[PDB]
Structures are given as structure tokens and as C-alpha cells.
Amino acid sequence: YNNVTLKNLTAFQLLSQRENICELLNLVESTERHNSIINPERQRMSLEEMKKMLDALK
Amino acid sequence: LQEQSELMSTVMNNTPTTVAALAAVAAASETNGTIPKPRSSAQLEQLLYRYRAIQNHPKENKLEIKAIEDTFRNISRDQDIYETKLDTLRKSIDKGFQYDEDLLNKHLVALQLLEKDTDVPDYFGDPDTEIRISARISNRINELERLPANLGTYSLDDCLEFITKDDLSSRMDTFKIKALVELKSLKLLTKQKSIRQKLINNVASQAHHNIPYLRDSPFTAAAQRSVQIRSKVIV
Amino acid sequence: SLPIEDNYIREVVSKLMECVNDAVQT
């Protein structure tokens, strides 16, 4: 798995190219890959860390 | 120790009264593990017939006559039961069924293929399962290598040729050629395997200069272009 | 139990609307 092949590159490009067309028709959900990376409680926890760094640096 | 073949050996050696298998408990019962109820149509039954017909002369040295006669009683009883059941079975037939034709076809073809051990289609790696293939081919080789060499046909089309006492008809060998094409094709198997390896490992070994939709892709052309880069000359 | 000819043995023997309903809308 350390190396890549022509089959691996072609499969990766075909998979990533069919995932992009299925968002126009909305026949795939992809809410998990969205919200596991947005994660708004993690976002406000990080903003609280930035606010605490503003408090500690002033 | 195959007493149902020992009787055959004593019959085909033409000397069965001179030994008579030494019917005691030590010899006539050591091969039996009554007698085991012979399996064939008549090939193991005519031997029992001849064995009783030879053992009518001593009549007391052989104690095993009674179990053989009990099996004769069993055979006669089973035969009478079958004759009564065949008399009733021909009376138990409905007056109208009108058996379908295109299923009689399938039952006849299926029975015929299931007689002579060939695979029937339905229409109704891993060296465990590699040896189970390579042990069915040795079956067919050691079944074809026991056919007699003087094997010949007699088709229903020699009547149009008027063969005399010595005329040498021209369709006599339509089975012995067919019984050698199989026997020599099942020995030239690991020669066509070695030719198929040299075929596939020289057609698939290029795979990017003959096939058009592979030598026109971006990544294959980029790899073939990038392997040909001559090294940089310092100064 | 007579054998049969070889040339007679060889002789007897919802995903649509899920795109259309999304192609009519958009």
C-alpha cells in the first residue's frame, strides 16, 4: 500500500470524479463527511482557546 | 479379504474342489468381516450356484452351506415380493395422465448423462480444490488405458457398401481414433499450459504499446515519457 | 441405456426514476 499503480490512480480519479457529479443530482447524502470536519462544537471550543489566548496575552 | 473374489479366483483357476476355502470358523468367517449378500446381477450369483453345485459331493466338511441357502431363500423371497409388487404396480396405473414430451426429453438426457459420470447442466489457486481436479484426470487416463487395442466400430451405414468375406470397410476406425484423441490430449496438457504461459507473458507483458486506450491515458504516457529522461550533464 | 448423439446433447442444452426525478427538477 506504500506504492501506487495505474489501477490505483485511475480508480482514485474515477471515484473522486463520480463523487462530484452525484452532488448536483443529490442522490448521495455526504452529510457525515461534511459535519465530521466542520464540527461546530469543536469550532467554538477552538474559538474559546483563541479567546483564552487573547486573555493570557493581554 | 474379498471372499467374493476368492470364489471367482477358484472358479477361473478351474480348481475349486481341491481347496474349497477350508470352511471352518477360522477361515470362512475371517473373510466375511452369514455371507454378505452379493452385489452384482449374476456375476457373484452364478459363482454361488457353482459353489453349491461343487459342494454337493462332500456335504459335511463345509458348514457354511446353510447361510448360503438362507441367502437363496432371501433371494427367492425378495423375487416373489417383487413379482407380487409388479403385479400390483401394473394394476395401480391411472387410465389417463398424458405424460409431457419435452420433460421426457430432459429426463432421458439427464439419466443418460448421470449414468456415465459426466456433468449435467441444471435447466430444471486453493490447492485443496486443485488436487480434486487433478485426481479426476488420472481417473480418465487410467480408464482409457484399459480399453482393448482391437476396438472397432460397426456403423449402420456399412450395408450400402456390400462388404465381402475380405473387403476392409472404410468406417471401421471411427471410435479408436476418438479414443486416442482424448488419451493423448489428456497427456499434452502441461505442454499447452507452457505454450499459454509464453503467449500471455508476451501479450500482456507489453500491454501499453498495442492496446490503444491504455497508451493514450495521461498517466501511462507520462510514465513512459518520464522513464526516458537522460541524466543532466554537470558543466 | 443406448448413448445419445453429442450434437443432440449440445442441442437440447427502481434505479431508473431515482435519476429522472432529479433531472426534471434540476
Side-chain angles (χ1 to χ4, degrees), chain A, chain B residues 16 20-21 23-24 26-28 33-235, chain C:
Chain A
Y1 293 99
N2 298 115
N3 55 3
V4 295
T5 62
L6 192 274
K7 184 178 179 180
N8 286 319
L9 292 173
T10 305
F12 179 75
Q13 186 179 3
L14 183 143
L15 189 274
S16 178
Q17 190 175 3
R18 293 190 298 180
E19 287 183 353
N20 289 321
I21 195 65
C22 291
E23 292 181 354
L24 290 177
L25 302 176
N26 198 0
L27 59 92
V28 68
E29 300 294 326
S30 69
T31 62
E32 293 85 4
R33 279 82 179 272
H34 187 199
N35 202 3
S36 66
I37 307 300
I38 294 297
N39 198 1
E41 56 90 21
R42 181 180 63 86
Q43 185 176 2
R44 65 178 294 276
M45 182 267 177
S46 180
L47 186 61
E48 285 180 353
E49 283 186 348
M50 303 302 282
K51 187 183 288 184
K52 188 266 296 295
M53 190 175 288
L54 263 293
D55 185 74
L57 269 297
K58 290 179 74 67
Chain B
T34 59
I35 58 169
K37 185 61 67 69
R39 295 184 291 117
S40 69
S41 296
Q43 290 180 355
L44 276 71
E45 188 181 3
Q46 301 296 323
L47 294 175
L48 291 174
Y49 292 172
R50 184 178 180 270
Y51 195 75
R52 183 176 181 269
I54 291 168
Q55 288 182 353
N56 286 319
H57 294 285
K59 197 177 180 180
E60 282 87 8
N61 297 114
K62 309 286 103 174
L63 84 162
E64 65 180 0
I65 302 170
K66 187 255 183 65
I68 302 169
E69 292 178 354
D70 289 331
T71 55
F72 288 124
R73 292 178 180 177
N74 291 317
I75 289 167
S76 66
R77 184 174 178 178
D78 292 329
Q79 187 59 252
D80 197 1
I81 289 167
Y82 182 78
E83 287 179 352
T84 56
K85 286 184 180 180
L86 187 144
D87 291 330
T88 60
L89 192 276
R90 293 181 180 178
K91 292 181 180 180
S92 67
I93 299 167
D94 294 333
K95 294 184 290 294
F97 179 73
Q98 293 301 111
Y99 196 88
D100 50 354
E101 303 297 334
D102 293 330
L103 175 137
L104 193 150
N105 288 316
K106 295 181 181 180
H107 286 293
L108 286 182
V109 173
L111 184 142
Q112 184 58 253
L113 296 177
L114 287 172
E115 285 181 350
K116 298 179 176 69
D117 191 76
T118 186
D119 188 75
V120 182
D122 292 329
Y123 56 87
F124 295 113
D126 288 329
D128 287 332
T129 183
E130 185 68 28
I131 299 170
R132 294 177 185 175
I133 299 169
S134 179
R136 302 293 294 163
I137 288 173
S138 178
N139 189 9
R140 188 64 175 169
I141 292 173
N142 287 319
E143 187 177 1
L144 290 178
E145 286 181 351
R146 292 188 292 114
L147 297 180
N150 53 3
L151 193 147
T153 73
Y154 184 75
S155 68
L156 296 176
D157 298 335
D158 286 333
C159 65
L160 294 175
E161 294 180 354
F162 309 105
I163 290 97
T164 63
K165 185 71 72 176
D166 192 2
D167 198 76
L168 268 67
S169 65
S170 65
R171 295 187 184 184
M172 189 64 71
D173 289 331
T174 61
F175 285 165
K176 190 170 74 174
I177 300 172
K178 283 173 65 177
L180 289 176
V181 170
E182 291 188 355
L183 191 273
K184 293 186 178 181
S185 66
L186 291 172
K187 289 183 179 180
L188 294 173
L189 186 60
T190 61
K191 185 66 173 67
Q192 74 169 358
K193 286 184 179 180
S194 69
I195 297 169
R196 283 173 179 174
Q197 286 186 357
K198 293 181 182 179
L199 182 66
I200 296 171
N201 289 321
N202 288 317
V203 173
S205 177
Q206 296 174 357
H208 296 289
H209 302 286
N210 298 318
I211 291 96
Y213 57 90
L214 288 175
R215 61 101 178 268
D216 294 334
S217 69
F219 308 103
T220 301
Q224 292 177 354
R225 184 164 61 247
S226 68
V227 74
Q228 295 297 110
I229 291 170
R230 188 165 67 91
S231 65
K232 188 179 262 76
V233 173
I234 292 96
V235 178
Chain C
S1 178
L2 268 72
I4 310 170
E5 295 179 354
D6 188 74
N7 297 114
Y8 186 76
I9 299 169
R10 300 172 63 178
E11 182 179 0
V12 175
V13 174
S14 66
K15 292 181 180 180
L16 295 174
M17 295 301 291
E18 293 179 353
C19 297
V20 178
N21 291 116
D22 293 329
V24 171
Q25 295 180 357
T26 62

